[PDB]
Structures are given as C-alpha cells and as structure tokens.
Amino acid sequence: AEAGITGTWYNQLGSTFIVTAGADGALTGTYESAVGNAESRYVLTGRYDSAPATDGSGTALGWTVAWKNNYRNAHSATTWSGQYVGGAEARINTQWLLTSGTTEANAWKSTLVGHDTFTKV
Amino acid sequence: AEAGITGTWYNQLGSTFIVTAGADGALTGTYESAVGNAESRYVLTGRYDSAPATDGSGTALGWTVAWKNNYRNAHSATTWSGQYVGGAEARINTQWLLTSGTTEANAWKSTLVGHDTFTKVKP
Amino acid sequence: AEAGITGTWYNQLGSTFIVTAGADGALTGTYESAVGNAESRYVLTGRYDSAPATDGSGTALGWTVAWKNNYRNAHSATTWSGQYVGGAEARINTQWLLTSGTTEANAWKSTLVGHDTFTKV
Amino acid sequence: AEAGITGTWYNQLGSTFIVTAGADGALTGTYESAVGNAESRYVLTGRYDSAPATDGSGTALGWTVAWKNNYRNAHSATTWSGQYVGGAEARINTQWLLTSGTTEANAWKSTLVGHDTFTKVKP
Amino acid sequence: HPQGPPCK
Amino acid sequence: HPQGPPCK
Amino acid sequence: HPQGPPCK
Amino acid sequence: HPQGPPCK
C-alpha cells in the first residue's frame, strides 16, 4: 500500500535497506552492507510514484547509493530501478546499475547490471 | 567535484537536467522533457562520490526521477547511473533503467535500458 | 558439467529451451513460447565456454532468438547472457536484452532488459 | 535485409565484426579485438529478422561471442542485442551484456552492460 | 510477445 | 513519454 | 565492494 | 579483455 514502502527490507545478499516514503514521492534512508557492522551504512535517496494506478499494478520507484561514507569510499554508485508490490508478501523487485569512476580507457567496463528482490523478512 | 557537476546540462534527445551538488554527496534538481513547454519539470534526487580519485578518473553518481508532477503521472521512474568527466568540455556519461508500474503478468517487460550523454551549458 | 547444458530447460514464465552443446562451443536448439503449442517455436543459436575454469566457477554462455518463424514475426530479437552451474540442481542464470526494430524516433525505448533462471524441472 | 548486414563493420573501440547473414535469419562470422594482431579472432553466431517491417524501421538482430579460441580463454561471453539501420551510412546500434564465469559468491558482479555502434566498411 | 507468459 | 524527444 | 555479500 | 581497446 502507499506508505507500505516505509520499513526495513532485506535482499537475497543480506543487505538491509531502511526507508521512509514521504507523501509526495521522496524516498530517504540508509543502505547497509555485509555483516551489519557499524558504518557499513550509506545514505540513499530516491523517488517513487505517490499516486500509482488504481489497477493492481506495482508502484514504480528508484533510488541511488554512492559508496562513500566516513570510513570507506569505493568510488562507485548504484541505482536500483523497480516496483513495489504490497500485500501479505510485500516485495520490491529491482534491476540495478553499479558504475565505478574509471579513466576513459576503462570506461567500457565501468558498469555492472544485476537484479535484487527485497522483502521485509 | 560539486562545482563541476552543478549547473544545467542537456542530452542528445534535447532534455534538460538542472542540478546542484551539495558538499555531503547529495544531488537535487529538476529534469525536463525534450522541448515541450514549462510544465514538463520533474523533481530529481541522487548522490555522487564527493571525494573522487587524482587521477583522470570520472566521479561516479546517479539519480532518479519518478515521472509524476502536478500535471502528469506516467507511473514510472528512471534511474541514471554514470560518471561525470570534467575538463573544458565536461560530460556526464550514463546508462539508465526506466521501470513502469505493471501487473504481475507484464512484470517481465516492465524495464527499458538505454544510455544518455549530457553536455554542460550553464553553471 | 560440460555437456550438462544439453537438455530441456524451463524458466519461471513457462517457456521451454531445448539445446545441444557441441564440444567446441556452439549452442543450437529451439525456444518455445507460451502454451507449448505447435510453432510457438523459434530457432536459437549461441556459444559457451567449452573449457571453463577448473575452480568452481559457472560456465559462461549466451544465445539469441529472433522472434520470427513461419507463422509469426514480432520484429524483435532477444539475447540471454549468463552462466551455467551444474550439480544436483543445475541452473542457467541469465540477464537478457530484447530489442524491437523501431524508427529513429522510438529508438530510445527499443530495448527491454530482464533476467530469467532456467532449471531442468 | 541480408545483403545490407553482410560485410565488415567496426565500432568505436576499433574492434572488427565480419558477418554473413543467411536467407534463413542466421548470422555467422568472426569478431576481432581492437587492433592486436591476427590471433584475436573469435567465432560469432546470431540471428536477425529476415522479414523486417516498410518502413524506416531497423531490423532487430543479436549475436554472441564466447571469448575462447585456440590462443586464449577469458571464461566469458558477450551478447549484443540491437538494430541494423541501412542507408548510405548503415549502422548497427547495440546494447551488450558481458558475463564472466564466477563462483556463487561473485555471481552478483558477473555481468557488465555497455553499448556499441558499428559502421559498415566492406560488403 | 512470444517471450512472455501465456495470455490466458 | 517525458524521457523521449518531442512528438512527430 | 559494500554492495556484495560478506567476505566470510 | 578482447572486447576493450588496445592496452596502454
């Protein structure tokens, strides 16, 4: 449901995503990596459709995480694009792009693509 | 660097991207469709590496636009992931994913992929 | 295992993929769509690593299907890129690109990207 | 059309693509790395729509190259999916996926995505 | 499209 | 779609 | 990379 | 990688 996005989600790799969905389309939160750890946390910001279609379609959304925090800088950024489906088993199904900052010479293999499914379990 | 990214940029389709990079790695701005009057502005938010490498390496960044504003709602969102390359001719080279809200049955064709290159025009 | 690719695989949508892996890297077969049906079949051709690494890595492969047969022409083609992992539960994990033939004007949204996992069940 | 695709093409990195389109929708040929002597040739196989639309629409096609030959084996395969656009300046515009064989644990970063444009040089 | 699921 | 060019 | 699984 | 440019 609308603010059904708000919460803690986990993906198949064990990363945790904590977000707040504002009534007007904003997505803000923390994305934490492996182990849980202390600052394995990175800031994330995104946007979503705050007035989705009234047909059983999912809600489009997307967000970004630049992999730099006060402890690490992996000179890369990831964007996840996908949709939220609520209900008994709510999930966020995404495809993502991870681009690393390279020199021109390596620009051809600067971007990895994958997919992740997040659940609240 | 934040200055370098801040400004107005255009891509090969004629769309407008106006961004401000903040010292904390944040990106805020507006995205506009190719020509098409004034009410074709959408909010964008993203993040960039505020401490890139020395070398002639690009600065990684990314942002998202949910295609809904006070005039239209296309039930979709696009995210651009790429690198900012500064110099006299600064460019932001990206790959993007556009996902539309679908029903369970069309979920298989819910995402389009493409690439855009942005050229800087104003600071 | 090497010629463990040969066989009938199914994906999460119900499509069936029947392939023959030649000792030198070729992949040939039929890809059939929904319902099973008669010619819901399309020809596929690809390539794979016939000398994969001797470390527990999967085997890289890829193939293409142009969606035209003697009954239908959907003016598009799909390419699946991924790897094969054998064992008790053999699977072929892929990401794919479906490009439709468009006019210049629509070229910007000519390509869809997704992912499929095939199993022999 | 098959003729139109048959020939030698090069992309912006300097790689060579030599293809023959057969009447049945088949594509066979060789792909070569950017400059780099003779033993940098790999086999390619693909398919294209042998009955495209009238209109000025491109012809969809795709092909794959497994980066293994008698000299090297990079344990990876790339597939290009795109459209052939004919005319006096014919071009094949593509998006590609390069997947490397990995262990279960690095499977998450096993695939790279990019785009290449090919220009025709010989028939 | 023949790549998708059935139209049942 | 606001991400594509102007129309015809 | 922080996006991947643990290095355990 | 044979898909990228010549080396340095």
Side-chain angles (χ1 to χ4, degrees), chain C residues 32-53:
Chain C
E32 40 191 318
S33 166
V35 186
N37 216 289
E39 249 195 54
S40 45
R41 308 179 305 240
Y42 301 87
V43 176
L44 71 88
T45 190
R47 309 283 300 165
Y48 74 103
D49 182 5
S50 44

PDB file of all heavy atoms in Angstrom, chain C residues 32-53:
ATOM      1  N   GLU C  32      10.697 -22.301 -27.228  1.00  0.00           N
ATOM      2  CA  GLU C  32       9.245 -22.263 -27.490  1.00  0.00           C
ATOM      3  C   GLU C  32       8.616 -21.503 -26.364  1.00  0.00           C
ATOM      4  O   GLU C  32       8.952 -21.574 -25.198  1.00  0.00           O
ATOM      5  CB  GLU C  32       8.607 -23.688 -27.611  1.00  0.00           C
ATOM      6  CG  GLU C  32       9.108 -24.722 -26.642  1.00  0.00           C
ATOM      7  CD  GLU C  32       8.606 -26.147 -27.062  1.00  0.00           C
ATOM      8  OE1 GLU C  32       7.444 -26.221 -27.449  1.00  0.00           O
ATOM      9  OE2 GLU C  32       9.393 -27.085 -26.973  1.00  0.00           O
ATOM     10  N   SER C  33       7.686 -20.791 -26.853  1.00  0.00           N
ATOM     11  CA  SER C  33       6.859 -19.891 -26.073  1.00  0.00           C
ATOM     12  C   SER C  33       5.625 -20.576 -25.461  1.00  0.00           C
ATOM     13  O   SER C  33       5.413 -21.774 -25.557  1.00  0.00           O
ATOM     14  CB  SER C  33       6.594 -18.779 -27.117  1.00  0.00           C
ATOM     15  OG  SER C  33       5.542 -17.938 -26.672  1.00  0.00           O
ATOM     16  N   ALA C  34       4.889 -19.697 -24.840  1.00  0.00           N
ATOM     17  CA  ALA C  34       3.611 -19.948 -24.122  1.00  0.00           C
ATOM     18  C   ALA C  34       2.742 -21.071 -24.688  1.00  0.00           C
ATOM     19  O   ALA C  34       2.718 -21.303 -25.878  1.00  0.00           O
ATOM     20  CB  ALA C  34       2.790 -18.653 -24.135  1.00  0.00           C
ATOM     21  N   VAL C  35       2.038 -21.719 -23.800  1.00  0.00           N
ATOM     22  CA  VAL C  35       1.119 -22.842 -24.155  1.00  0.00           C
ATOM     23  C   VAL C  35       1.845 -24.103 -24.639  1.00  0.00           C
ATOM     24  O   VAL C  35       1.367 -25.200 -24.433  1.00  0.00           O
ATOM     25  CB  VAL C  35       0.105 -22.345 -25.266  1.00  0.00           C
ATOM     26  CG1 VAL C  35      -0.966 -23.418 -25.576  1.00  0.00           C
ATOM     27  CG2 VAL C  35      -0.560 -20.996 -24.856  1.00  0.00           C
ATOM     28  N   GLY C  36       2.960 -23.946 -25.271  1.00  0.00           N
ATOM     29  CA  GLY C  36       3.713 -25.116 -25.783  1.00  0.00           C
ATOM     30  C   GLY C  36       3.229 -24.751 -27.157  1.00  0.00           C
ATOM     31  O   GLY C  36       3.823 -23.888 -27.754  1.00  0.00           O
ATOM     32  N   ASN C  37       2.172 -25.358 -27.623  1.00  0.00           N
ATOM     33  CA  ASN C  37       1.602 -25.042 -28.985  1.00  0.00           C
ATOM     34  C   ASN C  37       2.410 -25.724 -30.090  1.00  0.00           C
ATOM     35  O   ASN C  37       3.244 -26.550 -29.778  1.00  0.00           O
ATOM     36  CB  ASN C  37       1.601 -23.499 -29.199  1.00  0.00           C
ATOM     37  CG  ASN C  37       0.373 -23.082 -29.979  1.00  0.00           C
ATOM     38  OD1 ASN C  37       0.247 -23.345 -31.156  1.00  0.00           O
ATOM     39  ND2 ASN C  37      -0.571 -22.432 -29.369  1.00  0.00           N
ATOM     40  N   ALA C  38       2.153 -25.379 -31.330  1.00  0.00           N
ATOM     41  CA  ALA C  38       2.910 -26.013 -32.459  1.00  0.00           C
ATOM     42  C   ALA C  38       4.056 -25.084 -32.721  1.00  0.00           C
ATOM     43  O   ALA C  38       5.113 -25.276 -32.158  1.00  0.00           O
ATOM     44  CB  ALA C  38       2.040 -26.125 -33.746  1.00  0.00           C
ATOM     45  N   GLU C  39       3.879 -24.083 -33.554  1.00  0.00           N
ATOM     46  CA  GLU C  39       5.064 -23.224 -33.735  1.00  0.00           C
ATOM     47  C   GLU C  39       4.956 -21.901 -33.054  1.00  0.00           C
ATOM     48  O   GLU C  39       4.578 -20.858 -33.556  1.00  0.00           O
ATOM     49  CB  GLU C  39       5.419 -22.930 -35.213  1.00  0.00           C
ATOM     50  CG  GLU C  39       6.770 -23.737 -35.419  1.00  0.00           C
ATOM     51  CD  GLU C  39       7.504 -23.301 -36.675  1.00  0.00           C
ATOM     52  OE1 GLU C  39       7.726 -22.104 -36.740  1.00  0.00           O
ATOM     53  OE2 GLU C  39       7.798 -24.174 -37.479  1.00  0.00           O
ATOM     54  N   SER C  40       5.322 -22.129 -31.844  1.00  0.00           N
ATOM     55  CA  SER C  40       5.457 -21.185 -30.739  1.00  0.00           C
ATOM     56  C   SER C  40       6.994 -21.481 -30.666  1.00  0.00           C
ATOM     57  O   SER C  40       7.608 -21.081 -29.714  1.00  0.00           O
ATOM     58  CB  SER C  40       4.775 -21.725 -29.496  1.00  0.00           C
ATOM     59  OG  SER C  40       5.272 -23.073 -29.552  1.00  0.00           O
ATOM     60  N   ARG C  41       7.568 -22.155 -31.645  1.00  0.00           N
ATOM     61  CA  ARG C  41       8.971 -22.486 -31.644  1.00  0.00           C
ATOM     62  C   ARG C  41       9.703 -21.567 -32.587  1.00  0.00           C
ATOM     63  O   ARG C  41       9.228 -21.270 -33.676  1.00  0.00           O
ATOM     64  CB  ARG C  41       9.177 -23.914 -32.129  1.00  0.00           C
ATOM     65  CG  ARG C  41       8.312 -24.911 -31.366  1.00  0.00           C
ATOM     66  CD  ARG C  41       8.572 -26.341 -31.933  1.00  0.00           C
ATOM     67  NE  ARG C  41       8.341 -26.332 -33.411  1.00  0.00           N
ATOM     68  CZ  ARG C  41       7.434 -27.097 -33.957  1.00  0.00           C
ATOM     69  NH1 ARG C  41       6.322 -27.333 -33.318  1.00  0.00           N
ATOM     70  NH2 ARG C  41       7.674 -27.603 -35.135  1.00  0.00           N
ATOM     71  N   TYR C  42      10.836 -21.211 -32.051  1.00  0.00           N
ATOM     72  CA  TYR C  42      11.806 -20.332 -32.685  1.00  0.00           C
ATOM     73  C   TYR C  42      13.204 -20.982 -32.530  1.00  0.00           C
ATOM     74  O   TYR C  42      13.498 -21.665 -31.565  1.00  0.00           O
ATOM     75  CB  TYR C  42      11.755 -19.003 -31.982  1.00  0.00           C
ATOM     76  CG  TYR C  42      10.380 -18.379 -32.050  1.00  0.00           C
ATOM     77  CD1 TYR C  42       9.401 -18.649 -31.121  1.00  0.00           C
ATOM     78  CD2 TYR C  42      10.099 -17.512 -33.061  1.00  0.00           C
ATOM     79  CE1 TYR C  42       8.167 -18.035 -31.232  1.00  0.00           C
ATOM     80  CE2 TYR C  42       8.882 -16.907 -33.165  1.00  0.00           C
ATOM     81  CZ  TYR C  42       7.907 -17.158 -32.254  1.00  0.00           C
ATOM     82  OH  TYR C  42       6.721 -16.483 -32.377  1.00  0.00           O
ATOM     83  N   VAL C  43      14.030 -20.720 -33.494  1.00  0.00           N
ATOM     84  CA  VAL C  43      15.403 -21.241 -33.533  1.00  0.00           C
ATOM     85  C   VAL C  43      16.289 -20.354 -32.666  1.00  0.00           C
ATOM     86  O   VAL C  43      16.095 -19.152 -32.619  1.00  0.00           O
ATOM     87  CB  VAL C  43      15.897 -21.187 -35.019  1.00  0.00           C
ATOM     88  CG1 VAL C  43      17.342 -21.627 -35.141  1.00  0.00           C
ATOM     89  CG2 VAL C  43      15.046 -22.054 -35.922  1.00  0.00           C
ATOM     90  N   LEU C  44      17.225 -20.983 -32.028  1.00  0.00           N
ATOM     91  CA  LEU C  44      18.160 -20.218 -31.180  1.00  0.00           C
ATOM     92  C   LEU C  44      19.551 -20.732 -31.544  1.00  0.00           C
ATOM     93  O   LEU C  44      19.717 -21.868 -31.961  1.00  0.00           O
ATOM     94  CB  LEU C  44      17.900 -20.431 -29.655  1.00  0.00           C
ATOM     95  CG  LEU C  44      18.262 -21.800 -29.068  1.00  0.00           C
ATOM     96  CD1 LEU C  44      19.748 -21.847 -28.610  1.00  0.00           C
ATOM     97  CD2 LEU C  44      17.350 -22.051 -27.811  1.00  0.00           C
ATOM     98  N   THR C  45      20.518 -19.866 -31.390  1.00  0.00           N
ATOM     99  CA  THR C  45      21.930 -20.222 -31.685  1.00  0.00           C
ATOM    100  C   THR C  45      22.756 -19.407 -30.631  1.00  0.00           C
ATOM    101  O   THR C  45      22.374 -18.287 -30.270  1.00  0.00           O
ATOM    102  CB  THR C  45      22.199 -19.828 -33.185  1.00  0.00           C
ATOM    103  OG1 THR C  45      23.470 -20.384 -33.502  1.00  0.00           O
ATOM    104  CG2 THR C  45      22.339 -18.313 -33.401  1.00  0.00           C
ATOM    105  N   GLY C  46      23.840 -19.978 -30.190  1.00  0.00           N
ATOM    106  CA  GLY C  46      24.671 -19.275 -29.183  1.00  0.00           C
ATOM    107  C   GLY C  46      26.050 -19.889 -29.105  1.00  0.00           C
ATOM    108  O   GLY C  46      26.460 -20.673 -29.948  1.00  0.00           O
ATOM    109  N   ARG C  47      26.715 -19.515 -28.056  1.00  0.00           N
ATOM    110  CA  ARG C  47      28.069 -20.004 -27.799  1.00  0.00           C
ATOM    111  C   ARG C  47      28.301 -20.101 -26.285  1.00  0.00           C
ATOM    112  O   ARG C  47      27.641 -19.416 -25.505  1.00  0.00           O
ATOM    113  CB  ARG C  47      29.172 -19.013 -28.309  1.00  0.00           C
ATOM    114  CG  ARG C  47      28.970 -18.563 -29.803  1.00  0.00           C
ATOM    115  CD  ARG C  47      29.421 -19.698 -30.764  1.00  0.00           C
ATOM    116  NE  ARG C  47      30.873 -19.995 -30.512  1.00  0.00           N
ATOM    117  CZ  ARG C  47      31.458 -21.088 -30.953  1.00  0.00           C
ATOM    118  NH1 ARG C  47      30.766 -22.007 -31.561  1.00  0.00           N
ATOM    119  NH2 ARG C  47      32.732 -21.276 -30.794  1.00  0.00           N
ATOM    120  N   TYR C  48      29.213 -20.958 -25.914  1.00  0.00           N
ATOM    121  CA  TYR C  48      29.525 -21.135 -24.456  1.00  0.00           C
ATOM    122  C   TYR C  48      31.029 -21.424 -24.307  1.00  0.00           C
ATOM    123  O   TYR C  48      31.699 -21.670 -25.304  1.00  0.00           O
ATOM    124  CB  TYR C  48      28.676 -22.318 -23.855  1.00  0.00           C
ATOM    125  CG  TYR C  48      29.137 -23.701 -24.267  1.00  0.00           C
ATOM    126  CD1 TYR C  48      29.859 -24.431 -23.341  1.00  0.00           C
ATOM    127  CD2 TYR C  48      28.848 -24.253 -25.493  1.00  0.00           C
ATOM    128  CE1 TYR C  48      30.277 -25.701 -23.643  1.00  0.00           C
ATOM    129  CE2 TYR C  48      29.267 -25.530 -25.795  1.00  0.00           C
ATOM    130  CZ  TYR C  48      29.989 -26.266 -24.865  1.00  0.00           C
ATOM    131  OH  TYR C  48      30.428 -27.554 -25.095  1.00  0.00           O
ATOM    132  N   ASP C  49      31.508 -21.383 -23.090  1.00  0.00           N
ATOM    133  CA  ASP C  49      32.968 -21.658 -22.827  1.00  0.00           C
ATOM    134  C   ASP C  49      33.067 -23.194 -22.726  1.00  0.00           C
ATOM    135  O   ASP C  49      32.571 -23.765 -21.772  1.00  0.00           O
ATOM    136  CB  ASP C  49      33.368 -20.993 -21.492  1.00  0.00           C
ATOM    137  CG  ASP C  49      34.841 -21.191 -21.191  1.00  0.00           C
ATOM    138  OD1 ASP C  49      35.660 -21.707 -21.910  1.00  0.00           O
ATOM    139  OD2 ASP C  49      35.182 -20.765 -20.105  1.00  0.00           O
ATOM    140  N   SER C  50      33.700 -23.803 -23.695  1.00  0.00           N
ATOM    141  CA  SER C  50      33.893 -25.303 -23.751  1.00  0.00           C
ATOM    142  C   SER C  50      35.108 -25.779 -22.909  1.00  0.00           C
ATOM    143  O   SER C  50      35.418 -26.953 -22.827  1.00  0.00           O
ATOM    144  CB  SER C  50      34.085 -25.722 -25.242  1.00  0.00           C
ATOM    145  OG  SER C  50      34.974 -24.779 -25.833  1.00  0.00           O
ATOM    146  N   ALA C  51      35.782 -24.847 -22.309  1.00  0.00           N
ATOM    147  CA  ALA C  51      36.967 -25.150 -21.456  1.00  0.00           C
ATOM    148  C   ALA C  51      36.846 -24.162 -20.297  1.00  0.00           C
ATOM    149  O   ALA C  51      37.674 -23.284 -20.157  1.00  0.00           O
ATOM    150  CB  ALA C  51      38.260 -24.910 -22.259  1.00  0.00           C
ATOM    151  N   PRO C  52      35.809 -24.270 -19.502  1.00  0.00           N
ATOM    152  CA  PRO C  52      35.671 -23.414 -18.294  1.00  0.00           C
ATOM    153  C   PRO C  52      36.789 -23.612 -17.273  1.00  0.00           C
ATOM    154  O   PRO C  52      37.522 -24.581 -17.301  1.00  0.00           O
ATOM    155  CB  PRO C  52      34.272 -23.745 -17.786  1.00  0.00           C
ATOM    156  CG  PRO C  52      34.023 -25.192 -18.282  1.00  0.00           C
ATOM    157  CD  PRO C  52      34.669 -25.208 -19.683  1.00  0.00           C
ATOM    158  N   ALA C  53      36.875 -22.661 -16.392  1.00  0.00           N
ATOM    159  CA  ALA C  53      37.926 -22.719 -15.351  1.00  0.00           C
ATOM    160  C   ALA C  53      37.670 -23.910 -14.446  1.00  0.00           C
ATOM    161  O   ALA C  53      36.538 -24.299 -14.229  1.00  0.00           O
ATOM    162  CB  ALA C  53      37.909 -21.395 -14.545  1.00  0.00           C
TER     163      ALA C  53
END
